[PDB]
Design an enzyme around this catalytic site. Structure first.
Site, PDB file in Angstrom:
ATOM      1  N   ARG A 143     -21.061  61.037  57.193  1.00  0.00           N
ATOM      2  CA  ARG A 143     -21.122  62.495  57.290  1.00  0.00           C
ATOM      3  C   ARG A 143     -19.771  63.069  57.700  1.00  0.00           C
ATOM      4  NH1 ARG A 143     -22.555  67.046  60.941  1.00  0.00           N
ATOM      5  NH2 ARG A 143     -22.920  65.706  62.753  1.00  0.00           N
TER       6      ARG A 143
ATOM      7  N   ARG B 132     -21.307  83.988  66.461  1.00  0.00           N
ATOM      8  CA  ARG B 132     -20.303  83.619  67.462  1.00  0.00           C
ATOM      9  C   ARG B 132     -19.857  84.813  68.302  1.00  0.00           C
ATOM     10  NH1 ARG B 132     -19.647  78.073  66.072  1.00  0.00           N
ATOM     11  NH2 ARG B 132     -19.712  78.035  68.352  1.00  0.00           N
TER      12      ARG B 132
ATOM     13  N   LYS C  41     -31.425  71.514  56.316  1.00  0.00           N
ATOM     14  CA  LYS C  41     -31.549  71.323  57.759  1.00  0.00           C
ATOM     15  C   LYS C  41     -32.457  72.390  58.344  1.00  0.00           C
ATOM     16  CE  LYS C  41     -27.981  70.116  60.177  1.00  0.00           C
ATOM     17  NZ  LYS C  41     -26.650  69.902  60.811  1.00  0.00           N
TER      18      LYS C  41
ATOM     19  N   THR D 299     -29.425  64.496  65.653  1.00  0.00           N
ATOM     20  CA  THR D 299     -29.121  65.086  66.966  1.00  0.00           C
ATOM     21  C   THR D 299     -29.846  64.413  68.138  1.00  0.00           C
ATOM     22  OG1 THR D 299     -30.788  66.912  67.069  1.00  0.00           O
ATOM     23  CG2 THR D 299     -28.756  67.341  65.820  1.00  0.00           C
TER      24      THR D 299
END
EC number: 2.7.1.40
Lengths: 524, 519, 137
Positions: free
Chosen positions: B61, B108, B258, B316
C-alpha cells in the site's frame, strides 16, 4: 427502577437459517432485542467500597462483588462485605425488584515478589535495554534492590529456570533473559526496559512453578471466607488437580457449598486444563496473566479452548483482566476494548470480570454501565440455535428424568418463541441443567434458598429471584405462587408481557427427587 | 514454506472443533489470509522490501494523504525491483501487488496562531467558535477555529458533535449561524494545525473524488497499479465516480471502497454492489460510531462480503504497539485473530511497517497470528452455509467450482489447482471458502497480483510460452503448480489434488474438473 | 443419494470422488443426463451406484459391456462403432457428441440444457477422472 433492570425483549423474531445469514442481518442502528444474559462481576475497592456507590452499581447491573485478598486486612474486607450486604438489602422491601448479589473471595495465591528498592518502599529505578541485572536469593539484598541487583522470595527459582528462559517482572512491563545459572543467583539481560518498583509480581514463562497451592496466608483468608459466608472463591494460580483439591480441603465441611472457581494464570494450567476443570466448580481465564507466560499469538486459542470445554462440560467460565482498562482514567472505553469484551461474550463466556475499572477507578459507575451495554449488544450477535443443536448432539444419551425434561424445555423455548423459562429450584441444579443447553430465552430461577440465588449468577442466562413467601400447605398452590411470582418479575423486567408464552419447570410430588414436570403456560 | 499435513478428519460440530484446539501443537494449514503492508520511510528501500516479501507480504500500500508523485513513483520502483529479484526461479516467484490509497475528502482545520507547529489548550466547558471566514485560516486559537468544509453549517444541527484530531477533542454545537458555529468543548486536549475533523452521523456532502485525488488516480493508472483503496465512501455514486475517473484506461484496476463513517455502514449494500471489494477501517469508525457497536459493523460487513463473494479487508489498529516494540500485546494478537475468524480476506498493517522501528518483525507476527488463527476456522460450515444460500443456476463454471470444493473435502486434497486468464475461475472457487489452498496458475501478471485480495488463493505466474497442442499446455501449467505446491509444502508425492481447466481453447467456461494424484 | 453418500467409506480414489461429484452436479444443474465414456462399464456402474435422477448415457466400443450395463439401474448403454480417432481429444468429442445425439433423439434433453460428462485425460491413465459440465449443442 434501575438502569440495567428493565431489559425489554421483543421475542418472536424468527431465528435465522444459517450463522452466515445471521451475521448479515445485524443492523447496528436498531436496539438490542434480548436480555443481557452474561453475568457481570465487579471488583470492589477504594473507589466503590461505600454503601452509596454500591447501590448505584447494583442498579446498573452488578451481579457479583469480588474482593481482592492480595491487598488489605481481614478487618478491612469484613466492612467491604458489610457494605455490599447493606446496599443489596436496600432493595429487599419489594421482592420483585430485589436482585441478589454474590460475594467472591479472590485469593492472593502463590507468587514471586521482588524486594524493596534502595532508598525507601516507593522509589523506582530505570532498567535499560541490554543492561545486566543480577537476581539473588540472599536475604541481605531484600531491601537493597537497584539497577544491578534484584531480590525475590521464591527460593527454588534456580531449579525451575534454565539458561535462556524469560522472567517477566511487574506484570510483564519488564522482561529479562537468563544468561548464567548459579548456586543461589541468576545473571540476566534486560530486554524490555521500564521503571522497576518495590514488591512486584514476577512470572516464569513455561516453568513448573512448585510453590504451595495454598500459601499459609491463604489458609487464613479461606477460613475468613467461610466465616463471613462468601458464595464463591476465585482460587489463584492453579496448576493442577491437587491444587484445587487442597483449596476444597481447607474450606472443608463448614464451607462445602462455597463454589471454587479455578484461575488459569500460567502455561501449566492450560496444559492440565482437563484435570483442573473436572476438580473445579468453574473456571476463570485470566488473560493478562497468560499474555505474560505464553505467546501473544496463542492466547486467543487458549481462551477459546477453555471457554469451549467449560460450555461442553456445563460449568461456568469467566473472562477476566484487560477488559475495560482505559476506564480507570476515562469516562468511555476504546473501540478495541468494546470489541474484546464482545468477542469474549461471543466465544461463550458466562461472566465478565472488571478488575481495576471499578476497584480504584475515576469512573466505577460508568464502567458497569458500559460493560452492561456491550454485553447486551453482543447478545444480538450470538446464534443461540447452533450452540444448542451441537450441545444436544454432543451430550451422552441417558434416560435421566431431569436432563430429558430440561432439554425439552429449551427445545420448546425456541418453538414457542418463549419469553422465559421459569424454573423452581432449591439447590439451583435444575436451573443449571437448563442453562447448560444455552437457550435464547432468559431462565427465571425461583428459589427460597438465598445462597443458591446468589450462586446462580455464575451461570449464563439465569436470572435468579428470591421468594421469601412462606411454604403453602397445598403443594400445588405453593407452585402456582412461585410461578406467578416469576411471572410478575418477568413482566416488570420486560422479558415478556400479557399473552406471551413461557415454559415452566416444577416437581410433581413434594418428595420426588427430580424436577421432572414441564408445562407451556401463557402469561396471565 | 507453509507445510500442511492434510488428511486430519474434520470435527463433527463447531463446539467440538474449538475443544480440540491445542496451543502446543504447530499449525496444520497454510496461512490463507492475505497480508497488505503499507510502505513508507522505514520500509521504502529495495533491501527492506526483499525481506518483507520473504516474510509474507502480498500487497504494498502507498498512502497518498502524504508525499509527492515523484516520491511515490520511486516507492513503486523499489517494490518492483525487490519483487523481480526472485523472478529468476519461477517456483519461488511470489507476485506482489501495488495499492494506491487515496487522500479522500476531509475536513481540516487552520494553522494555529504563531506558527504551523504550536498548540493551544481547549479546556472542558470552554466556548469555541468555528468559522468559515478565510481571514481566520492562519489565526486559529483557544477562541476561534477555521476549517475548510464550507457547507458545515448545513449538515450540522444544534446539539451535534464535532470530533477534532481523530477524536482527541470533541465539541457540541450550541448555536448555528450564517457562516459560523458556537460550540462547547467536552473532551479537552492540545489542538494543533491542520487536524482531521469528523461529523458523527451527518450527510457529509463533500466531493467523492477531491481535485487532488483526480490527479492521484491518473498517476495510479499511469503507473499501472493493481488496486485502488478509495477513501471515505458514503454511497454508490461515490464509487461510480472513482470508476469514472480511472476510466477505460484503468478499467481493470480493482476499487476497494473504505467504510470510514456512519453513512457508509447504513448504505453498505449499495456500496458493496458498486465496489470490487471493501475495507473496514475500524479506527475511523471508532470515532464516528459508538465503541460498543463497531464489532457489530465489522461482523456484518465481513459477513455480507463473504456472501456476495467479494474481498473484505480489515484495516487500522492491528499491531500498533509494534511501531515502538519488537512484539505485539496479547490483545493485539487476539484482535487480529478474531478478524481472520470473522471472515476477512486480508489484514492491513498501517503504521507498524510504514514508519516503525520494527517493520520486518511486524510482517512476521502478522503471518504467525494469521496462520495460528487458521487452525480455529471451521471451514466446513462456512461452505455448507455458502452453498445453501447461493442461488440455483445451471451455469457450467459455478457448478464445477462448487464440485471442486466439495471434492477438496472428500479427498482431503492438498490443493485446488485452477488455470485462469482473468482470475475469475479462481475467485469463484475461493468464494466457497475451501480448507485447501487454491493454487491459481496464470500467464497474465496483473491477475496474479490482483488475486491476493481473495482469501486462500496462492497466485503463481507461469512465464512459459503457449504450447501448440492445447492438452500439453494444460499439462505443463498443471505440472508447474504441482512443483510449486511441493516446494511450498502444501502437498507431497502421492497426495490428491483437484484441477480446474477448460476443454476447448475457445470454450468460454472453466468447466473441466479432475481429481489427480500428485506425481 | 444423500444416504448412499453418507454410508460410503471415505477414500481418495480419483474415480469414485469424481463419480459422486458427477451425481452431485446432476442435481444442482438439473441435468438431462450423465454421459460416461467407458470400456469395461465400471465407470458407469460407479455413477449408477449413487442413484441419480438423470439417466446415465454410457458410451462404449465393447459390445458386451453395452449389454451387461442393463443390469444396472438408470444406465442407458449405447454402442459406438466409429473407429478410434488418432487425436485423443477428438475421439472423446466424437463419442460425447454421439451420446448428445442419442439423448436428443430419446428426448432425455434438448438444445440448450446442461449435461455432465465423465471421460479420461490421458489415453493410458487408469482412471475415469475428468468431469465437465457441458451445455447441449
Amino acid at each position: 427502577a434501575g438502569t440495567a433492570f428493565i431489559q425489554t425483549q421483543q421475542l418472536h423474531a424468527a431465528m435465522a437459517d444459517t450463522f452466515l445469514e445471521h451475521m448479515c442481518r445485524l443492523d447496528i442502528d436498531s436496539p438490542p432485542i434480548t436480555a443481557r444474559n452474561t453475568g457481570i462481576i465487579c471488583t470492589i475497592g477504594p473507589a466503590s467500597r461505600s454503601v452509596e456507590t454500591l447501590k448505584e452499581m447494583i442498579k446498573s447491573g452488578m451481579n457479583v462483588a469480588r474482593l481482592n485478598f492480595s491487598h488489605g486486612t481481614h478487618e478491612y474486607h469484613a466492612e467491604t462485605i458489610k457494605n455490599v450486604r447493606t446496599a443489596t438489602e436496600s432493595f429487599a422491601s419489594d421482592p420483585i425488584l430485589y436482585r441478589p448479589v454474590a460475594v467472591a473471595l479472590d485469593t492472593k495465591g502463590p507468587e514471586i515478589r521482588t524486594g524493596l528498592i534502595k532508598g525507601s518502599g516507593t522509589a523506582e529505578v530505570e532498567l535499560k535495554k541490554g543492561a545486566t541485572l543480577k537476581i539473588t536469593l540472599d536475604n541481605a539484598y531484600m531491601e537493597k534492590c537497584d539497577e544491578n541487583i534484584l531480590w525475590l522470595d521464591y527460593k527454588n527459582i534456580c531449579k525451575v529456570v534454565e539458561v535462556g528462559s524469560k522472567i517477566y517482572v511487574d506484570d510483564g512491563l519488564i522482561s529479562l533473559q537468563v544468561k548464567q545459572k548459579g548456586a543461589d543467583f541468576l545473571v540476566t539481560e534486560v530486554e524490555n526496559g521500564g521503571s522497576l518498583g518495590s514488591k512486584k509480581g514476577v512470572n516464569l514463562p513455561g516453568a513448573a512453578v512448585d510453590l504451595p497451592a495454598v500459601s499459609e496466608k491463604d489458609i487464613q483468608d479461606l477460613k475468613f471466607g467461610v466465616e463471613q459466608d462468601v458464595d464463591m472463591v476465585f482460587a489463584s494460580f492453579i496448576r493442577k488437580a491437587s491444587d484445587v483439591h487442597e483449596v476444597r480441603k481447607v474450606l472443608g465441611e463448614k464451607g462445602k457449598n462455597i463454589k471454587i472457581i479455578s484461575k488459569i494464570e500460567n502455561h501449566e494450567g492450560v496444559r492440565r486444563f482437563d484435570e483442573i476443570l473436572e476438580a473445579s466448580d468453574g473456571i476463570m481465564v485470566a488473560r493478562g496473566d497468560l499474555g505474560i507466560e505464553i505467546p501473544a499469538e496463542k492466547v486467543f486459542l487458549a481462551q477459546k479452548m477453555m471457554i469451549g470445554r467449560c460450555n461442553r462440560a456445563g460449568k461456568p467460565v469467566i473472562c477476566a483482566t484487560q477488559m475495560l482498562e482505559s476506564m480507570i482514567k476515562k469516562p468511555r472505553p476504546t473501540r478495541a476494548e468494546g470489541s474484546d469484551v464482545a468477542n469474549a461474550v461471543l466465544d461463550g463466556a458466562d461472566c465478565i470480570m472488571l478488575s481495576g475499572e471499578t476497584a480504584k477507578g475515576d469512573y466505577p459507575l460508568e464502567a458497569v454501565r458500559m460493560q452492561h451495554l456491550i454485553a447486551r449488544e453482543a447478545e444480538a450477535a450470538i446464534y443461540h440455535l447452533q450452540l444448542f443443536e451441537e450441545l444436544r448432539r454432543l451430550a451422552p444419551i441417558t434416560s435421566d428424568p431431569t436432563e430429558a425434561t430440561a432439554v425439552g424445555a429449551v427445545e420448546a423455548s425456541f418453538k414457542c418463541c418463549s419469553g422465559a423459562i421459569i424454573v423452581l429450584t432449591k439447590s439451583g441444579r435444575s436451573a443449571h441443567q437448563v442453562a447448560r443447553y444455552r437457550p435464547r430465552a432468559p431462565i427465571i430461577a425461583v428459589t427460597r434458598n438465598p445462597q443458591t440465588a446468589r450462586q446462580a449468577h455464575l451461570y449464563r442466562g439465569i436470572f435468579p429471584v428470591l421468594c421469601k413467601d412462606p411454604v403453602q400447605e397445598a403443594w400445588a398452590e405453593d407452585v402456582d405462587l412461585r410461578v406467578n411470582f416469576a411471572m410478575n418479575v418477568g413482566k416488570a423486567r420486560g422479558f415478556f408481557k400479557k399473552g406471551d408464552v413461557v415454559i415452566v419447570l416444577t416437581g410433581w410430588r413434594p418428595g420426588s427427587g427430580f424436577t421432572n414436570t414441564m408445562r407451556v403456560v401463557p402469561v396471565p
